[PDB]
């Protein structure tokens, strides 16, 4: 649960790129590993921030008001 | 007794003769002796409701041997159209046979049968077999060699004739 343990577990599960093989092979593995490391770092920083991170107001920004305005727009027009 | 006039249409000995023989003897003919004019064969089935007789008029499918041709259809009580799924041309010829049959027989049950499906080389895919749809023909993939759906057309015709939808053929 503690941040240190989560970060250590995250960094443990990703094996470093294999230095064995050709230069270009190792370097392509390094590039992919670095991209995935940036992804991991972003996720870890998001966890570090807090455990909720976002408010639910984005939903009314997308659906609740987009439903309420047209709820007001409702018109009998007979029948 | 309890016999119906059945007319078989298609390319001569292209399965009609083979189909009739296979239902008659059970042997699967290999030679292709194109049928001459028509051959009338009794063909008996036994259903849960008794015997049934088909007066199958295996007609010649080659114009040179058509002979009386449409005259064979007079007083027909059921019709089995045939075509070889391995040759598209015999399929495109299907509408012509349907036209002639309906022209002579306006209101008769029609079974569209794709013969010798067993032969691996299938040209007329199941997707494109649609003429029966608009014409309201009852379709069947069959093969006189391996007997796939070997009985379905005759059973369907017997059900449509006697009127028993759940009627079933019996061994004896």
């Amino acid at each position: 649960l503690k941040a240190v343990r989560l970060i250590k577990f995250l960094y443990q599960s990703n094996p470093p790129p294999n230095p064995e093989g050709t230069r270009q092979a190792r370097r392509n593995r390094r590039r992919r590993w670095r991209a995935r490391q940036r992804q991991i770092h972003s996720i870890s920083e998001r966890i570090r921030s807090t455990y909720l991170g976002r408010s639910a107001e984005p939903v009314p920004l997308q659906t609740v008001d987009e439903m309420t305005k047209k709820f007001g727009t409702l018109t009998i027009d007979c029948n | 007794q309890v016999q119906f006039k059945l007319v078989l249409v298609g390319d001569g000995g292209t399965g009609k003769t083979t189909f009739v023989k296979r239902h008659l003897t059970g042997e699967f003919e290999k030679k292709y002796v194109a049928t001459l004019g028509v051959e009338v064969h009794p063909l008996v089935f036994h259903t849960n409701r008794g015997p049934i007789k088909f007066n199958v008029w295996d007609t010649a499918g080659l114009e040179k041997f058509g002979g009386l041709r449409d005259g064979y259809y007079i007083q027909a009580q059921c019709a089995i159209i045939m075509f070889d799924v391995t040759s598209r041309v015999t399929y495109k010829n299907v509408p012509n046979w349907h036209r002639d049959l309906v022209r002579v027989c306006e209101n008769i049950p029609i079974v569209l049968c794709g013969n010798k499906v067993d032969i691996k080389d299938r040209k007329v895919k199941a997707k494109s077999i649609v003429f029966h749809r608009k014409k309201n023909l009852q379709y069947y993939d069959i093969s006189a060699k391996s007997n796939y759906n070997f009985e379905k057309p005759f059973l369907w015709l017997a059900r449509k004739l006697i009127g028993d939808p759940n009627l079933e053929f019996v061994a004896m």
């Binding site: - | 080659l62 114009e63 040179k64 040759s87 041309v89 015999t90």
Partner: protein
């Protein structure tokens, strides 16, 4: 692909091959194969048209094979089909040469000829639209010559 024996084989077998192909085509029993007929005839005629067959097929006449072929085909069909009008055969052969690069149109032309041979047609050509079909054949041949020149 084998040039050395090509001329010899042509001289040996070309007329025989055309005879048998036509005997088959005029037979309705083999209608389904017409595409292959169309596939091969158009080929051979093209070979005739470009003169890739170099030797004259008539030892008694060292003329370009094309005209000899036209007379031979006309004579053969007329002998086999005495009741046919000569203009019909002329038109049909002309189309054969004009249509050797349009397999669909070539096949429809063969089917038209097969329709004709089934009919004992008198001198009355009014129903035949020979002028209209000739105009269509001229247009097709014009497109064929344009295609050949564009190369």
């Amino acid at each position: 692909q084998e040039e050395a024996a090509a001329q010899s084989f042509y001289q040996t077998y070309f007329c025989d091959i055309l005879q048998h192909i036509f005997s088959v085509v005029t037979d309705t029993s083999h209608t389904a194969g017409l595409t292959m007929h169309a596939s091969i005839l158009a080929y051979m005629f093209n070979l005739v048209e470009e003169g890739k067959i170099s030797t004259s097929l008539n030892p008694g006449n060292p003329v370009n094979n094309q005209i000899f072929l036209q007379e031979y085909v006309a004579n053969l069909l007329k002998s086999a089909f005495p009741h046919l009008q000569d203009a019909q055969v002329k038109l049909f052969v002309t189309g054969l040469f004009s249509l050797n690069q349009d397999i669909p149109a070539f096949k429809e032309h063969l089917r038209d000829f097969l329709v004709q041979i089934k009919e004992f047609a008198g001198e009355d050509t009014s129903d035949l639209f020979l002028e209209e079909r000739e105009i269509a054949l001229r247009q097709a041949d014009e497109e064929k010559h344009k295609r050949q020149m564009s190369v």
